[PDB]
Design a protein around this ligand. Structure first.
Ligand SMILES: COCCOCCOCCOc1ccc(C(C)(C)CC(C)(C)C)cc1
Ligand SMILES: [Cu+2]
Length: 116
């Protein structure tokens, strides 16, 4: 059981409401590899390229623009504000592949949706 699952499911619920506005600012597809034992326990895609966006399990149906790899616990610590994702990147706990420049847009945008 991964705690990250609750977050991804809630994100999916959120996008059915704020999706269209999130997809216009981001315009990208994000893949997530959540580890538990250095072992990938779950893969998630957050597609923000059309409509209201979508969250689904597994690898991206097409190319992912950015892939983020981190532990279940570290993901949760970033979600709860206890671990800065940029510090985690420079420390080696958070890995990012692909277009790392796109990673900025995502946190900032949903956060601003976390204050409404
Ligand atoms: C151009 O960037 C310079 C290098 O900095 C890299 C920073 O990388 C950290 C940002 O990547 C993340 C990591 C996690 C997240 C969260 C977990 C907040 C996204 C979420 C809540 C939608 C899962 C967002 C962006
Ligand atoms: Cu920033």
């Amino acid at each position: 059981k991964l705690q990250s699952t609750f977050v991804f499911e809630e994100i999916g619920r959120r996008l059915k409401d704020i999706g269209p506005e999130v997809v216009k600012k981001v315009n990208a597809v994000f893949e997530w590899h959540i580890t538990k034992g250095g072992n990938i326990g779950a893969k998630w895609t957050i597609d923000l390229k059309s409509g209201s966006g979508k969250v689904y399990q597994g690898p991206a149906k097409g190319a992912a623009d950015t892939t983020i790899i981190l532990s279940d616990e570290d993901f949760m610590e970033v979600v709860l504000g206890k671990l800065d994702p940029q510090k985690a990147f420079f420390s080696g706990r958070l890995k990012a592949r692909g277009n790392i420049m796109l990673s900025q847009k995502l946190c900032m945008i949903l956060k601003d949706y976390a204050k409404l």
